Amino acid sequence: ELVMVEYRYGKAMPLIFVGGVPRSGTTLMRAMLDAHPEVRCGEETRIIPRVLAMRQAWSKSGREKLRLDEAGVTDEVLDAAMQAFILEVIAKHGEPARVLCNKDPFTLKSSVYLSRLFPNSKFLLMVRDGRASVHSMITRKVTIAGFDLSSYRDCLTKWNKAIEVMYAQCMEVGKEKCLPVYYEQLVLHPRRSLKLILDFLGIAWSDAVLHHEDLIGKPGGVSLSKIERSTDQVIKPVNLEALSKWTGHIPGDVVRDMAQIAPMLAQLGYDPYANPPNYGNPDPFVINNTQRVLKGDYKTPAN
């Protein structure tokens, strides 16, 4: 119903929600979708997960839920207000496009709820080896509530619980509406991965998803925040630099206890005993991207 410079948006439109634990390729994924001529994701809104969390807290409190129900502010009203708020933020914080998309990592803790609010929405759950994600948080000093960066053990424990929840939500939403996307397979085989992802989304193939680095900052392309912690990685083409760099840099006691700390590794198909797991041939495309990146073809932006 609501319009934009002529695109119409509403609760029945086919939204794409991207998420996962931070440092799992979520920015790369949404940037590759942003490259598509029909899709716009844009930057992390930050406020969508905040308001979702507050609204969830309201109903989890017995005392507050009683007061809200007695005020006529029922689940039905809260849900309508969440729909309207989320739609405005998604629609207005970036360029209009036929298919709107949002990437705020921890929103996928609420994919069951979002799939009911937005009955035609679909979900991409980014999955990356928790050892790589946690190594990224600690070495880059990425602040995430609840993740004590002084402890690999604590961060892997918290990674495990977060992805356990999001994976359970993805399974409950079901295979027609939520697709786990493995970062390692995305970087090894981006063409095959995006072919599968766009088929799942019901969106026609476009080569543009393999050209996202051409489209940084351009109209209809990839809008980046200079403050977000993945920006200087996503300005490069898909490459292998970050695939395995955690290995040998995790404390020995955590390596020993890996499968007990992070049982979701094996649940998701990762080898929690290998340092590191042995992946097969990357596509020639990514091998060439990688040597260009490592020899300095992509300069650090002045901004």
Place this chain on the structure above:
Amino acid sequence: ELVMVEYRYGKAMPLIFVGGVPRSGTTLMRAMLDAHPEVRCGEETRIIPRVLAMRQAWSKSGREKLRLDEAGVTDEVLDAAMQAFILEVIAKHGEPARVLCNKDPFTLKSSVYLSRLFPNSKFLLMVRDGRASVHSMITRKVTIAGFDLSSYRDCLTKWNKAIEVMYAQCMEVGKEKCLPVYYEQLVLHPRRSLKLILDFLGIAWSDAVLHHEDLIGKPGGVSLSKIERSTDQVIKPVNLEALSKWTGHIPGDVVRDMAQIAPMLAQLGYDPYANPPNYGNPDPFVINNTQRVLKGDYKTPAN
């Protein structure tokens, strides 16, 4: 644009926002408006002030505002999302009506902002002697963040600062859009007061506003929350029981220092030296209401 069982609602519609410090007649005011056939206010939503406060905090933080601006979540986007959220809650948490109304006391701390979000909205700032409001909070044990009920001095200090802010907002919005409504004049002269208020609002007179006790719980009437602290007072007709009952029950040192603790009393036209100020003849209507109330004509509801 948006519809309801056929009433249309949107950001240009003529909303009424009622507010003031709690225990200042805000529930009585909105109940008298609810009695009008064209207006529905309903219960305190609770969540409108919460989300307003959070959204204000976002922009007050230099670091967070930079991140939001870099994400495309500008003031323009935040404002659109606030409009959509607030409208859904106002519209859906009670019955539809031609004129929608909201009463959440501390929202009038933001009347300048709300008047810009909703350019045809108008505001009723309830004003009651701060000694009566604070006496009410303390004796009824009404929990309000920042008000230490063990201290008349602290509560009057906090009352003073709250009404100072809301009155300044009312003056900035200007006389065409915000009307201070004095509780004491409402209860002494309800017909005259409501005539002035409905004229200010641009709404035709209806006798119903002087019959709100007939309309409790009825369709098109006054919906109450059994948990709100004013409910067992507002089920009675306008009466004088609460006009002056604070007098002699305030600690002597606070009486001595009243004008220094609460300079807004004199600013608003109250006599901060009188215990209590001497009001003139109540309307016969209210005198009769009062003896009926005090002799027990209105039974305590079983619920």
